Enzyme design. Structure first.
Site, PDB file in Angstrom:
ATOM      1  N   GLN A 185     -34.613 -51.563 -19.048  1.00  0.00           N
ATOM      2  CA  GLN A 185     -34.406 -52.310 -17.812  1.00  0.00           C
ATOM      3  C   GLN A 185     -34.873 -51.512 -16.604  1.00  0.00           C
ATOM      4  O   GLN A 185     -35.621 -52.020 -15.761  1.00  0.00           O
ATOM      5  CB  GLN A 185     -32.930 -52.673 -17.671  1.00  0.00           C
ATOM      6  N   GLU A 216     -34.195 -56.912 -24.973  1.00  0.00           N
ATOM      7  CA  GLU A 216     -33.671 -58.086 -24.292  1.00  0.00           C
ATOM      8  C   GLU A 216     -34.805 -58.780 -23.552  1.00  0.00           C
ATOM      9  O   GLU A 216     -35.250 -58.271 -22.514  1.00  0.00           O
ATOM     10  CB  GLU A 216     -32.560 -57.680 -23.322  1.00  0.00           C
ATOM     11  N   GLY A 239     -29.635 -48.052 -24.255  1.00  0.00           N
ATOM     12  CA  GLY A 239     -30.192 -48.009 -25.591  1.00  0.00           C
ATOM     13  C   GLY A 239     -31.705 -48.026 -25.632  1.00  0.00           C
ATOM     14  O   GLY A 239     -32.322 -47.171 -26.274  1.00  0.00           O
ATOM     15  N   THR A 240     -32.315 -48.999 -24.953  1.00  0.00           N
ATOM     16  CA  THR A 240     -33.771 -49.102 -24.969  1.00  0.00           C
ATOM     17  C   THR A 240     -34.418 -47.880 -24.334  1.00  0.00           C
ATOM     18  O   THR A 240     -35.404 -47.350 -24.858  1.00  0.00           O
ATOM     19  CB  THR A 240     -34.215 -50.374 -24.252  1.00  0.00           C
ATOM     20  N   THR A 263     -22.505 -47.486 -14.380  1.00  0.00           N
ATOM     21  CA  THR A 263     -22.094 -48.775 -14.919  1.00  0.00           C
ATOM     22  C   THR A 263     -21.648 -48.636 -16.370  1.00  0.00           C
ATOM     23  O   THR A 263     -20.507 -48.957 -16.716  1.00  0.00           O
ATOM     24  CB  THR A 263     -23.232 -49.787 -14.797  1.00  0.00           C
ATOM     25  N   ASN A 319     -28.886 -41.613  -9.065  1.00  0.00           N
ATOM     26  CA  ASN A 319     -28.567 -42.814  -8.305  1.00  0.00           C
ATOM     27  C   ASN A 319     -27.689 -42.556  -7.094  1.00  0.00           C
ATOM     28  O   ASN A 319     -27.945 -43.128  -6.031  1.00  0.00           O
ATOM     29  CB  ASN A 319     -27.905 -43.849  -9.212  1.00  0.00           C
ATOM     30  N   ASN A 341     -36.021 -48.786  -6.242  1.00  0.00           N
ATOM     31  CA  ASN A 341     -37.290 -48.721  -6.949  1.00  0.00           C
ATOM     32  C   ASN A 341     -38.466 -48.643  -5.986  1.00  0.00           C
ATOM     33  O   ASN A 341     -39.511 -48.091  -6.340  1.00  0.00           O
ATOM     34  CB  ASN A 341     -37.426 -49.919  -7.880  1.00  0.00           C
ATOM     35  N   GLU A 352     -52.686 -28.959 -13.313  1.00  0.00           N
ATOM     36  CA  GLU A 352     -52.007 -27.803 -12.748  1.00  0.00           C
ATOM     37  C   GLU A 352     -50.591 -28.133 -12.290  1.00  0.00           C
ATOM     38  O   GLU A 352     -49.852 -27.224 -11.905  1.00  0.00           O
ATOM     39  CB  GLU A 352     -52.822 -27.206 -11.607  1.00  0.00           C
TER      40      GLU A 352
HETATM   41  N1  LIG Z   1     -32.183 -46.294  -9.818  1.00  0.00           N
HETATM   42  C1  LIG Z   1     -32.265 -47.363 -10.600  1.00  0.00           C
HETATM   43  N2  LIG Z   1     -31.597 -47.390 -11.805  1.00  0.00           N
HETATM   44  C2  LIG Z   1     -31.676 -48.475 -12.604  1.00  0.00           C
HETATM   45  C3  LIG Z   1     -32.427 -49.569 -12.225  1.00  0.00           C
HETATM   46  N3  LIG Z   1     -32.332 -50.498 -13.195  1.00  0.00           N
HETATM   47  C4  LIG Z   1     -31.543 -50.015 -14.177  1.00  0.00           C
HETATM   48  N4  LIG Z   1     -31.122 -48.767 -13.818  1.00  0.00           N
HETATM   49  C5  LIG Z   1     -30.261 -47.879 -14.607  1.00  0.00           C
HETATM   50  O1  LIG Z   1     -30.228 -48.335 -15.939  1.00  0.00           O
HETATM   51  C6  LIG Z   1     -28.940 -48.155 -16.481  1.00  0.00           C
HETATM   52  C7  LIG Z   1     -28.671 -49.247 -17.501  1.00  0.00           C
HETATM   53  O2  LIG Z   1     -28.961 -48.739 -18.780  1.00  0.00           O
HETATM   54  P1  LIG Z   1     -30.442 -48.872 -19.385  1.00  0.00           P
HETATM   55  O3  LIG Z   1     -30.943 -47.557 -19.925  1.00  0.00           O
HETATM   56  O4  LIG Z   1     -31.351 -49.407 -18.310  1.00  0.00           O
HETATM   57  O5  LIG Z   1     -30.276 -49.956 -20.555  1.00  0.00           O
HETATM   58  P2  LIG Z   1     -31.350 -51.131 -20.756  1.00  0.00           P
HETATM   59  O6  LIG Z   1     -32.698 -50.751 -20.202  1.00  0.00           O
HETATM   60  O7  LIG Z   1     -30.829 -52.406 -20.145  1.00  0.00           O
HETATM   61  O8  LIG Z   1     -31.433 -51.276 -22.348  1.00  0.00           O
HETATM   62  P3  LIG Z   1     -30.060 -51.424 -23.161  1.00  0.00           P
HETATM   63  O9  LIG Z   1     -29.302 -50.124 -23.107  1.00  0.00           O
HETATM   64  O10 LIG Z   1     -30.358 -51.771 -24.594  1.00  0.00           O
HETATM   65  O11 LIG Z   1     -29.251 -52.521 -22.519  1.00  0.00           O
HETATM   66  C8  LIG Z   1     -27.978 -48.206 -15.313  1.00  0.00           C
HETATM   67  O12 LIG Z   1     -27.010 -47.195 -15.443  1.00  0.00           O
HETATM   68  C9  LIG Z   1     -28.832 -47.924 -14.097  1.00  0.00           C
HETATM   69  O13 LIG Z   1     -28.471 -46.677 -13.555  1.00  0.00           O
HETATM   70  C10 LIG Z   1     -33.102 -49.551 -11.019  1.00  0.00           C
HETATM   71  O14 LIG Z   1     -33.768 -50.523 -10.674  1.00  0.00           O
HETATM   72  N5  LIG Z   1     -33.019 -48.445 -10.206  1.00  0.00           N
HETATM   73 MG   LIG Z   2     -31.061 -53.197 -21.987  1.00  0.00          MG
END
Ligand SMILES: Nc1nc2c(ncn2[C@@H]2O[C@H](COP(=O)(O)OP(=O)(O)OP(=O)(O)O)[C@@H](O)[C@H]2O)c(=O)[nH]1
Ligand SMILES: [Mg+2]
Ligand SMILES: Nc1nc2c(ncn2[C@@H]2O[C@H](COP(=O)(O)OP(=O)(O)O)[C@@H](O)[C@H]2O)c(=O)[nH]1
Ligand SMILES: Nc1nc2c(ncn2[C@@H]2O[C@H](COP(=O)(O)OP(=O)(O)O)[C@@H](O)[C@H]2O)c(=O)[nH]1
Lengths: 426, 436, 176, 426
Positions: free
Chosen positions: B10, B70, B143-144, B178, B205, B227, B253
């Site tokens: 995500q 997802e 997870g991803t 979160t 963050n 972002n 470098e």
């Molecule tokens: N700074 C920042 N952090 C983000 C953003 N979007 C998601 N995150 C981070 O992503 C975390 C959510 O866990 P992810 O590793 O993204 O999980 P996922 O990509 O949804 O994949 P799954 O774990 O399978 O659900 C949150 O704790 C956020 O801190 C973003 O747009 N900016």
């Molecule tokens: Mg995810």
């Protein structure tokens, strides 16, 4: 930003607060429907001192109605500007104290404070920067004198670093409306002397005299007295809401007018109160304002200042004035009435000026004096307390309600030493 | 001089969505994928050829794959305002989420879509002729990002080998997060980031929230606000490969200059001037002030106070009109300061690159147009705080063996749990040993 | 039955050794390439059961250590200055409250003694302490099973201990 | 593309799921006729999770309805939005069992589940990629508790790797509706704790008090008592249907909220909850929504959530907001109430947001807490069960149906051990 939350207690408190919100709503331009319908930009700048924004320009007062009978609540709801309050704030026990101080401080207070404190705490936490609490109540009734002071004690123990400015209408000797007035008033001042911070003393006898003479009113209903008290409230709370050439907030007024921590019973007036047959005749200037200010027959209390020396005085003017003029007028009054002012306090008068006068008028002022003449109002209630305590009249209605026989003696002792401590510094 | 991007999770996909907007705007590419006809800005016949291809008949396509399990985010992109920019096959979406499960994302579900992802990488990299290296965007809080990301790093390092991998990895904030089971995934992804990435730029963050509430003056920010400035940092880092300048600095470098040891590669990132559209013209923004604002402790994209340790190697990229003289003077003042102490074995610490392209601006952003900008990537020794802080709250969970059944039901083992634990221990021990 | 963190450490380490031996046997079996994960899950569930038992023992040990160390502090409050003599007297009262109050008459007598002793200071805590003493006295006088006066007795004991752990009430509490 | 199959059993399940289907169908924008009328495009994008196109817009819901008495299906078919469920999904017997877990779980569980399983298998294999099973029922009944529990066991045996959300309403101590409540509750728990993936437990007096205070309804009927539960059931499934800043599916919720597989009995909330009179005086924002979420008199379980600690909690927000303030509010709640949160987990609260509020509003939230205070909802049932089983009262109606005393002993043992380990984690 700096915050005032308005708690109204008892029938008198409910009516006075209703009229006061009717006044402030139009002073800021707010429609009784709740929306904003003003004209000038500068009205909006500080409406967060009294209001909250609910949903799309629905400005609602930050007030809590507190009482034990629902009849006055129903009357307030029926009355105009009723549909401005949050119905959640409406708290009442539905039983009734019946002008029983012990019942309202021990019996029904213990059951309704658990909710009224929750509501006031909710308002305080919805706030961000609390200046203090505003309270309206009486000293002659069960709910106003007992539960009001109980709530004041609760607030002081919870938030010990926030002021309370409380408008207390006190029982004047010759306009009495009940028989237990001193038994209520002395017991209430027992806690008002050590809990509250500014016990702004009012009485209806002086308001009646004012309506007779200055306004030349023939049949003054309670609406006009409530209007006068609301005008005094607005005059006090104006530097918080409009810009001015000088600033005097609630804390500044307190720190200027309280030399010793037991002398916080201020007595006030308002200018210009003009009969509507002389408003067309008199031309209003700063000397006229100060003349009607220091006019003893305009003070809203039955404590004539000719009999007492002034400890401190403050004048909050509203209107684009001349600061030299205001200050030299204060000096002229101080030099003329050279015997009524304390000798060990130079320039007993503090004057503030705000730039926005009240609605309609072009010039106004409010007088807040801390004099030693007020101790007559306490002598005249201590004497009655001794009179109805010498032969134990009406004691059992408080004794069997939870109170012992020593609290009355303690209240009499505090009356005596309070009068002694004004006499000492007179 | 071409670089490709892979977005996993995500966070990666959202940052890429807020970054490719900036890229296309900076090179003037219309959102539908073709440059306009009459309007002409800059000369970029090969200044676009790094991040974009050109499909013959004027239709640039980015060198990037987004990939998710997802499919919600991926089809959101597919239906968004960039339907035509992306190739209809670089957006890979599986079926079921990984659900804060490194095991589910790396062992069960991950092993059935990486086969397609890296095949797409192969037949995407065959189209280039000057490939530099990869850069990955992932969050280790899920997870991803952790599972599939670690798998893809493994199966891309084993395949392409020597090429550099610029990671831009989002660690969890110290106390704000979160997800709840995220320390487990953090350590599991660390034990793969340590030995498979040449340079890992960290991002946090709370630090970015602090930046965008103190300097940018936005008291209710969001991911669309984070972002954007992350993309700003990426663009400032990679500007040199697209734009000529007084002193061009390319991707080799950043490793042969900022990575003194094979394992000590962990970047603190900073960007100046993070400014609004009101203070901008009222502040005189020159090289000295922007550099001092870059080097102040509370201007780092990762929440760690870079006063505990020492700086090992700083790299400052300047965009806009900056002369060598005043930047040399500014770094001299930075050395003279009394707040930061450099490591002893590295007397010369900075490397300054310069480029003539002024910082871009996205209509609807908070960072107003400015003449110049500085982006710092610094290898320091104050990241042991971050690693140990995460370690303690991993141990707190692991003592009771809480949540471990969700992992053992997919293929994890307490063996590699303790392995990653001691791996973090070894890493922080290495930081302690190198600081002296 | 553990009482020391060292003994808890011994238990933890022997359990971890047991885990390692079990998983080593499972691995060296080298069979059931699909039931291996099920066996691993069952082994982890066993581990969870044993860890929860260790947690229960930890709770018991923590409570018993708390009581023992309160008694130890009371003893150190004794080892003939007048303040220390008053401390010994208060220790006697606390032991009277601690002992199983099997007899209602002795219960009432010791409550009477502690109420007399407490009613001397009367600043803020004695209000609730006296309220609880009167509560127990009334619920014993009217006649209720003392087995039902367990939490209330615990609360009286806790408030009395808090009273003792106070400088003015016990004029040596500045020590701890 | 992720698929949820919604099963509803018993009278409670039938009515609650009917309300849920009306709410969901209205929110996706389909009229009771059976066609589509959603103006936006975000609605068609995920109709496949709950609806299947039959031929020409007739989007038939994917649901299974099961009980033993014709009246419930007659009422469901008669009621509004009841003309859309496919008739072949009315898998159904003829007799009716009534308050007898043994009768509904042993006798009719033979000649009805043999077809309910067929219908469920067909409906599940109809879709491409399942997400899980969402089943709503009661615990104090016969045709919903026993029948639903046997269905749960069968479908767990059939499909092992699928989420299971059991919306189960549990018997109340004060709200007495039948005498076999402890028996049925213990029997159902004995299998739910063994098979159910997670149980979002509900009750009735908590919802009644909610409708008294937070809504000030005077005659709260089932038509709204179930509307609240329908709103919660719709709000839990927000990510699978709508985009947002941070998506999170049922697997994610289970991972974040189940430290051990025997700790999956959630208490549920929903915000905002306010009366229609004061729907104009309150401000809709995260600071107030979060405070409403973290309240005792706002949950939907008769377990005072402060009576213990929170092992874990989850918040699901809907509507444009700031994921900075959401996280800040969650952390603020944790730090303020650190006493009521378990120690060996940092950041006990998960918070996921989405960009689509429910229809007819602008912002919403949902609370799902796995706390140890839910132990009392089982302790009361366990003590009632012990008291009744010490006398073998009403036992013959089970013993002559086929159940023995061993089932009751096992149910009591499992109930007691899970309550004991809840007590341990505190
Ligand atoms: N700074 C920042 N952090 C983000 C953003 N979007 C998601 N995150 C981070 O992503 C975390 C959510 O866990 P992810 O590793 O993204 O999980 P996922 O990509 O949804 O994949 P799954 O774990 O399978 O659900 C949150 O704790 C956020 O801190 C973003 O747009 N900016
Ligand atoms: Mg995810
Ligand atoms: N200014 C003003 N005073 C009032 C009004 N109504 C009653 N009072 C005064 O309040 C006193 C009685 O107080 P009471 O209502 O019994 O207090 P309560 O028992 O707390 O409700 C009388 O002496 C009146 O003079 C009003 O409308 N305006
Ligand atoms: N909230 C709610 N509770 C219900 C409803 N119908 C029944 N109940 C409660 O559910 C409990 C047992 O349900 P029951 O009628 O036996 O379900 P059955 O097995 O289908 O008959 C009783 O205590 C009822 O109070 C309903 O529509 N809404």
């Amino acid at each position: 930003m700096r915050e005032i939350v308005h708690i109204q207690g008892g029938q008198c408190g409910n009516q006075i607060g209703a009229k006061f919100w009717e006044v402030v709503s139009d002073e800021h331009g707010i429609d009784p429907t709740g929306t904003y319908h003003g004209d000038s930009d500068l009205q909006l700048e500080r409406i967060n001192v009294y209001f909250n924004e609910a949903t799309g320009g629905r400005y609602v007062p930050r007030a809590i109605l507190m009482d034990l009978e629902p009849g006055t609540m129903d009357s307030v709801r029926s009355g105009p500007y009723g549909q401005i309050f949050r119905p959640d704030n409406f708290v009442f026990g539905q039983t009734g104290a019946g002008n029983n101080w012990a019942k309202g401080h021990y019996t029904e207070g213990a059951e309704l404070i658990d909710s009224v404190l929750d509501v006031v705490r909710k308002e305080a936490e919805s706030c961000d920067c609390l200046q203090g609490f505003q309270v309206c109540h009486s000293l002659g009734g069960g709910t106003g004198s007992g539960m009001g002071t109980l709530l004041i004690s609760k607030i002081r123990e919870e938030y010990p670093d926030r002021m309370m400015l409380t408008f207390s209408v006190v029982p004047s000797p010759k306009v009495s409306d009940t028989v237990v007035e001193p038994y209520n008033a002395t017991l209430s001042v027992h806690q008002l002397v050590e809990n509250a911070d500014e016990c702004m003393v009012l009485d209806n006898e002086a308001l009646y005299d004012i309506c007779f003479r200055t306004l030349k009113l023939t049949t003054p209903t309670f609406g006009d007295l409530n209007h006068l008290i609301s005008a005094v409230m607005s005059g006090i709370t104006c530097c918080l809401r409009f810009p001015g050439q000088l600033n005097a907030d609630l804390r500044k007024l307190a720190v200027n007018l309280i030399p010793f921590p037991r002398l916080h019973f201020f007595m006030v007036g308002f200018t210009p109160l003009t009969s509507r047959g002389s408003q067309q005749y008199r031309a209003l200037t700063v000397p006229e304002l100060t003349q009607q200010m220091w006019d003893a027959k305009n003070m809203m209390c039955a404590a004539d200042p000719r009999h007492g020396r002034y400890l401190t005085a403050s004048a909050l003017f509203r209107g684009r004035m001349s600061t030299k003029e205001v200050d030299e007028q204060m000096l002229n009054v101080q030099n003329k009435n050279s015997s009524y002012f304390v000798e060990w306090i130079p320039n007993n008068v503090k004057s503030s000026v705000c730039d926005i006068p009240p609605k309609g008028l072009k010039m106004s002022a409010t007088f807040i004096g801390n004099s030693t003449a007020i101790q007559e109002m306490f002598k005249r209630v201590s004497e009655q307390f001794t009179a109805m305590f010498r032969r134990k009249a009406f004691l059992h209605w408080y004794t069997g309600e939870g109170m012992d026989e020593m609290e009355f003696t303690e209240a009499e002792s505090n009356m005596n030493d309070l009068v002694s401590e004004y006499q000492q510094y007179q | 001089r071409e670089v490709i991007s892979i977005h996993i999770g995500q966070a990666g996909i959202q940052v890429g969505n807020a970054c490719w907007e900036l890229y296309c705007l900076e090179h003037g590419i219309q959102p539908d994928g073709q440059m306009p006809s009459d309007k002409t800005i800059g000369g970029g016949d090969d200044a676009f050829n790094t991040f974009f291809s050109e499909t013959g008949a004027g239709k640039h396509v980015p060198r990037c794959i987004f990939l998710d399990l997802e499919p919600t985010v991926v089809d959101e992109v597919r239906t968004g305002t960039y339907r035509q920019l992306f190739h209809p096959e670089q957006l890979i979406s599986g079926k079921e989420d990984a659900a804060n499960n490194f095991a589910r994302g790396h062992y069960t579900i991950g092993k059935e879509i990486v086969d397609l992802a890296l095949d797409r990488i192969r037949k995407l990299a065959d189209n280039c002729t000057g490939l530099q290296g990869f850069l990955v965007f992932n969050a280790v809080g899920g997870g991803t990002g952790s599972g599939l990301g670690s798998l893809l790093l493994e199966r891309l390092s084993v395949d392409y080998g020597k090429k550099s991998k610029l990671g831009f990895t989002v660690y969890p904030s110290p106390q704000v997060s979160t997800a709840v089971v995220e320390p487990y995934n953090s350590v599991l992804s660390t034990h793969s980031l340590l030995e498979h990435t040449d340079v890992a730029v960290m991002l946090d963050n709370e630090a970015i929230y602090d930046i965008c509430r103190r300097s940018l003056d936005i008291e209710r920010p969001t991911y669309t606000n984070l972002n954007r400035l992350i993309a700003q940092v990426i663009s400032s880092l990679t500007a040199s490969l697209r734009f000529d300048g007084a002193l061009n600095v390319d991707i080799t470098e950043f490793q042969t200059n900022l990575v003194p040891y094979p394992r000590i590669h962990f970047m603190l990132s900073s960007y100046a001037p993070i400014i609004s559209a009101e203070k901008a013209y009222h502040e005189q923004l020159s090289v000295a002030e922007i550099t001092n604002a870059a080097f102040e402790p509370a201007s780092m994209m990762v929440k760690c106070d870079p006063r505990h340790g020492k700086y090992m190697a700083c790299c400052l990229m300047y965009r806009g009109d900056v002369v060598p003289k005043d930047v040399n003077a500014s770094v001299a003042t930075i050395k003279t300061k009394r707040t930061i102490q450099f490591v002893d074995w590295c007397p010369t610490g900075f490397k300054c690159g310069i480029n003539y392209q002024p910082p871009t601006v996205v209509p609807g952003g908070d960072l107003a147009k400015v003449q110049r900008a500085v982006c710092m990537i610094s290898n320091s020794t104050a990241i042991g705080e971050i690693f140990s802080r995460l370690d303690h709250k991993f141990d707190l969970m692991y003592a009771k063996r809480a949540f471990v059944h969700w992992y053992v039901g997919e293929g994890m083992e307490e063996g590699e749990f303790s392995e990653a634990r001691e791996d973090l221990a070894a890493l922080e021990k290495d930081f302690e040993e190198v600081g002296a | 039955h553990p009482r020391t963190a060292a003994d808890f450490e011994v238990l933890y380490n022997e359990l971890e050794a047991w885990r390692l031996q079990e998983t080593r046997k499972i691995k060296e079996a080298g069979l059931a390439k699909e039931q291996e994960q099920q066996v691993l899950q069952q082994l982890l569930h066993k581990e969870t059961k044993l860890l929860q038992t260790i947690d229960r023992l930890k709770i018991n040990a923590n409570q018993e250590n708390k009581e023992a160390r309160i008694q130890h502090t009371l003893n150190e409050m004794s080892k003939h200055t007048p303040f220390t003599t008053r401390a010994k007297e208060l220790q006697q009262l606390y032991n009277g409250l601690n002992l199983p109050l099997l007899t209602v008459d002795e219960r009432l007598d010791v409550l009477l003694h502690v109420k007399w002793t407490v009613k001397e200071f009367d600043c803020d805590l004695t209000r609730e302490l006296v309220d609880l003493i009167d509560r127990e006295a009334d619920l014993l006088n009217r006649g209720r099973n003392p087995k039902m006066l367990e939490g209330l007795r615990k609360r009286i004991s806790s408030l009395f201990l808090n009273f003792i752990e106070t400088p003015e009430f016990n004029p040596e509490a500045v020590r701890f």
